[PDB]
């Protein structure tokens, strides 16, 4: 039940999403090993993901969390990169989208830095890079990220 | 998937070495995220 609505680059909504993508690029400690060497992106398309069932699933859980946390969902907009982006937009997030070996346990990971999520587009550590050229720093192949609405509720603070 | 820490709904990873990194987050229920936007892009080679 998912449809994708293309946003015009003239739309304020496109513009604010692009700005969050671009402005949250940083340098990474791997020198670009996982995600490639870059300071900015060429945005090709931004599509709104519309699925009523998946939205109602989200809002139902959001209300449960809010009611457990003094009417505060602690909702954020965060990036997610994954080889299964096209599965997620149709079927939703579930345990198959978890990073079993992640540093904060087996769960589904999100980033404030778009460039952190970019490290996971082709798999953990960038995998073997793009399918066509086997290049984690490919400048040719199209990549996709999700910009997601995430309910944090009461969040456990783990220091680095 | 694992469970959230008791009394919590997510984990926040706060960097303590890289002063420029932003936070990372983990949820343990897929129902706690909705994929609002699909962004198609290329990384750009620096000049
Ligand atoms: C479905 N999988 C395992 C793929 O075999 C997966 C693993 C990691 C990620 C992922 N991990 C992150 C970790 C941090 Cl610290 C920050 C952001 C991400 C992210 O966007 N995706 C996404 C999917
Ligand atoms: Zn490629």
Short description:
The complex is a heterodimer of chains A (160) and B (47). Chain A has 160 residues and is of the alpha+beta class. Chain A has helices at 12-23, 52-67, 85-91, 114-118, and strands at 3-6, 41-50, 75-80, 108-111, 143-151, 155-159.
Furnish the topology, listing elements before pairings.
The complex is a heterodimer of chains A (160) and B (47).
Chain A: E1 3-6, H1 12-23, E2 41-50, H2 52-67, E3 75-80, H3 85-91, E4 108-111, H4 114-118, E5 143-151, E6 155-159
Antiparallel strand pairs in A: 1-2, 3-5
Chain B: E1 10-14, E2 24-27, E3 33-43
Antiparallel strand pairs in B: 1-2
The complex binds the ligand CN(CCO)c1ccc(-c2nc3cc(Cl)ccc3c(=O)[nH]2)cc1 and zinc ion.
Domain PARP catalytic (chain A): 8-160
Family (chain A): Belongs to the ARTD/PARP family.
Organism (chain A): Homo sapiens
What does this structure look like?
The complex is a heterodimer of chains A (160) and B (47). Chain A is an alpha+beta fold. Chain A contains four helices and six strands. Chain A has a single domain (1-160), classed as Alpha-Beta Complex (Phosphoenolpyruvate Carboxykinase, domain 3). Chain A has helices at 12-23, 52-67, 85-91, 114-118; strands at 3-6, 41-50, 75-80, 108-111, 143-151, 155-159. Chain A starts with a strand and ends with a strand. Chain B has 47 residues and is mainly beta. Chain B has a single domain (1-47), classed as YefM-like fold (Other non-globular), CATH 6.20.320.10. In chain B, 0% of the residues lie in helices and 43% in strands. Chain B has strands spanning 10-14, 24-27, 33-43. A two-stranded antiparallel ribbon of chain B has the order 1-2. Chain B is flat, with a radius of gyration of 16 Å. The chains are: A alpha+beta (160), B mainly beta (47). At the A-B interface, strand 2, helix 2, strand 3, helix 3 and strand 4 of A face strand 1, strand 2 and strand 3 of B. Bound molecules: the ligand CN(CCO)c1ccc(-c2nc3cc(Cl)ccc3c(=O)[nH]2)cc1 and zinc ion. The site of the ligand CN(CCO)c1ccc(-c2nc3cc(Cl)ccc3c(=O)[nH]2)cc1 has 17 residues of chain A, from strand 3, strand 4 and helix 4. Chain A: This is Poly [ADP-ribose] polymerase tankyrase-2. Chain A: Residues 8-160 form the PARP catalytic domain. Chain A: It is found in: Cytoplasm; Golgi apparatus membrane; Nucleus; Chromosome, Telomere.
């Amino acid at each position: 039940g998912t449809i994708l609505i293309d946003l015009s680059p003239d739309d304020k909504e496109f513009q604010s999403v692009e700005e969050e993508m671009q402005s949250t690029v940083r340098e990474h400690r791997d020198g670009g090993h996982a995600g490639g060497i870059f300071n900015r992106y060429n945005i090709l398309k931004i599509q709104k993901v519309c699925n009523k069932k998946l939205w109602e699933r989200y809002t139902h859980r959001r209300k449960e969390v809010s009611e457990e946390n003094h009417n505060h969902a602690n909702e954020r907009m965060l990036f997610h990169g994954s080889p299964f982006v096209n599965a997620i937009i149709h079927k939703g997030f579930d345990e198959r989208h978890a990073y079993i070996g992640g540093m904060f346990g087996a769960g589904i990971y999100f980033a404030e830095n778009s460039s952190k999520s970019n490290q996971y587009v082709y798999g953990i550590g960038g995998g073997t890079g793009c399918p066509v050229h086997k290049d984690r720093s490919c400048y040719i192949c199209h990549r996709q990220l999700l910009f997601c609405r995430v309910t944090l509720g009461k969040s456990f603070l783990q220091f680095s | 998937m694992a469970h959230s820490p008791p009394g919590h709904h997510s984990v926040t990873g706060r960097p303590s070495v890289n002063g420029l990194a932003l936070a990372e987050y983990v949820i343990y229920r897929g129902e706690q995220a909705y994929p609002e936007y699909l962004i198609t892009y290329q990384i750009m080679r620096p000049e």
